Amino acid sequence: NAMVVTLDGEILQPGMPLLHADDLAAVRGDGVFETLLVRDGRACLVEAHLQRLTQSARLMDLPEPDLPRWRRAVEVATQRWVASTADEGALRLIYSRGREGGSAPTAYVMVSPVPARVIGARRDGVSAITLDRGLPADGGDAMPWLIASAKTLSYAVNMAVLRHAARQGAGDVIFVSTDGYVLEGPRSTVVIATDPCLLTPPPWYPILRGTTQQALFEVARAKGYDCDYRALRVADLFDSQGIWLVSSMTLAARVHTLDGRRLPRTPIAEVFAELVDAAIVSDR
Amino acid sequence: AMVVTLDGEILQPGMPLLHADDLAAVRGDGVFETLLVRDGRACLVEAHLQRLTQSARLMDLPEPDLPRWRRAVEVATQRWVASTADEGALRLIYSRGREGGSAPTAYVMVSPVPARVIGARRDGVSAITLDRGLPADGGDAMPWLIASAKTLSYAVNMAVLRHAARQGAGDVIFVSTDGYVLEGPRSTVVIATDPCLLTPPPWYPILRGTTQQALFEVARAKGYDCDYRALRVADLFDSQGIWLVSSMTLAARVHTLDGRRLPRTPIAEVFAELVDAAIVSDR
Numbered sequence A: 001n002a003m004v005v006t007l008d009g010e011i012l013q014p015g016m017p018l019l020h021a022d023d024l025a026a027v028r029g030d031g032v033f034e035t036l037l038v039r040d041g042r043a044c045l046v047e048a049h050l051q052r053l054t055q056s057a058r059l060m061d062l063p064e065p066d067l068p069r070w071r072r073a074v075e076v077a078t079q080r081w082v083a084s085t086a087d088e089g090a091l092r093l094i095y096s097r098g099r100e101g102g103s104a105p106t107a108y109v110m111v112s113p114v115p116a117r118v119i120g121a122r123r124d125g126v127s128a129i130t131l132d133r134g135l136p137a138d139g140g141d142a143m144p145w146l147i148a149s150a151k152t153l154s155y156a157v158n159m160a161v162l163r164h165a166a167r168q169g170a171g172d173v174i175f176v177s178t179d180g181y182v183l184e185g186p187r188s189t190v191v192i193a194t195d196p197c198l199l200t201p202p203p204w205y206p207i208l209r210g211t212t213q214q215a216l217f218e219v220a221r222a223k224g225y226d227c228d229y230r231a232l233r234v235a236d237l238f239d240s241q242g243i244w245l246v247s248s249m250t251l252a253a254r255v256h257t258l259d260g261r262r263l264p265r266t267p268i269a270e271v272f273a274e275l276v277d278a279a280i281v282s283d284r
Numbered sequence B: 001a002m003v004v005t006l007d008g009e010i011l012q013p014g015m016p017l018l019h020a021d022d023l024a025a026v027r028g029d030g031v032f033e034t035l036l037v038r039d040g041r042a043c044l045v046e047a048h049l050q051r052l053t054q055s056a057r058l059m060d061l062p063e064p065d066l067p068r069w070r071r072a073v074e075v076a077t078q079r080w081v082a083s084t085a086d087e088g089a090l091r092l093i094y095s096r097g098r099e100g101g102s103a104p105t106a107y108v109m110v111s112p113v114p115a116r117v118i119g120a121r122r123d124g125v126s127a128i129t130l131d132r133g134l135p136a137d138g139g140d141a142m143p144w145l146i147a148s149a150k151t152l153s154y155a156v157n158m159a160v161l162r163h164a165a166r167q168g169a170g171d172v173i174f175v176s177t178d179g180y181v182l183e184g185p186r187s188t189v190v191i192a193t194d195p196c197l198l199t200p201p202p203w204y205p206i207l208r209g210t211t212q213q214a215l216f217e218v219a220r221a222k223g224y225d226c227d228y229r230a231l232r233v234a235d236l237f238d239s240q241g242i243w244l245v246s247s248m249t250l251a252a253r254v255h256t257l258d259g260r261r262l263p264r265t266p267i268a269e270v271f272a273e274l275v276d277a278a279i280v281s282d283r
């Protein structure tokens, strides 16, 4: 089971319920969150994630998060996990609008074991299918009210999209816009390799900006790799030398099969795993 | 505010109920329904329990045990009716449960009807059209998007309303990418034209409104033609009346659309009466 740490720094008893029945995180999915990886005694890219928490909170008209109190709760939760186990941990920051009719927002951090599915996805890779998201490429900017760039607690469709792919024998999904441009995964950001330069869809599309992807581009640029944001199509995916689904939890999952077509492997696949490994510890 | 779990416990409202890893708060993974408590009973209970079943099927949630839900609704209702003669906002919460645990989370909750609802029934709302971002063939050609389910993931619905609130608008009418009228973030859109009532078809990426369906049933019985049609923004303005229909805000007439003040029509008073009779057709 998991560990809970409120921003007061108090660690919760394992069995005690925390949230009220009228908390807007549960009644309306009204809140924002972030996911952190605990590896080798510390959480990875803490500050980069707290900046996205601020950007998500700003988009959601939530009180601006108090970073000194969040940092302390992360440090306390981290020290409890690494004390209990040497395994990697899944750290989550939950930031809700609070109870209904009550102004105090709900905030706590939570660490849980890393699911075994990610260890296989890192190890073996994934098979993915392309799905039409339904949004055009101008969705994130021309329609700001749709808050597509925010990591909200309203993940029902993302989970349903994965359930749909599971029934099709696929391990993940790549969303594509109505006009045919690659968007993102339901829980990951798409990164491409070509000829050496690494490409990902631009962030002004109706997609999130990935903390892992940004840290990946920064180290890759420092090591001599040209990185750039371009509009990608499904054909560009198949003509590539590699496809990855990058995320804070699943560091780098290579897409070995896309829509039933097996994609060939490239020597670049082993170095890519090193880059994300080096990326998530760039803050250290 | 009263909470009644399906386990049969009538709980204190301020006592915490949910765990920190409950998927309703961690991922919004669940379904819900909202019912109005009026004159000693909840309105259109069976129609609401049927959509709860339909929402759970789209969400791969366990098939709801309706006898247990009926008891939780009847118990929660009668405790409200005992405390007050006021109308109540009763909602049923049905989540996938905790992480790594197979038991789904289920409970009923009653709260007072907000004052916003009392004004909207009396005076109506001003609404703006907004691009939903989905095309009109979105609900069918993209079944994975579960657009037809009343899910706990309303972050966009609430964010869309805050956006309209900052512009001085009281509600929103979603419009598809190709320009078809969809629904409201919390309501079903109904139009009047010449004595004819129209609503968007349910195969669009929209919910099926329990109130609108009951409205069509009563309206047809009293001689009014009702039908499902594809509407465009022009159809709204050439209409004789626009309403946002929902279980709590029974019928909110749109008095201002995209800044254009819309005049009142004799059908407007009849429209309010029909919805009143519809929500008690099961009685």
Ligand SMILES: *Cc1c(COP(=O)(O)O)cnc(C)c1O
Binding pocket: A035, A151, A184, A185, A186, A187, A188, A189, A208, A209, A210, A211, A212, A213, A246, A247, A248, A249
């Ligand atoms: C969390 C998430 C990502 C990846 O974000 P990271 O900061 O890199 O972990 C990508 N897409 C979606 C939809 C997400 O929710």
Ligand SMILES: *Cc1c(COP(=O)(O)O)cnc(C)c1O
Binding pocket: B034, B150, B183, B184, B185, B186, B187, B188, B207, B208, B209, B210, B211, B212, B245, B246, B247, B248
């Ligand atoms: C709840 C809801 C409605 C109306 O549903 P009723 O069963 O009539 O109350 C309409 N549109 C949306 C988006 C809703 O969530």
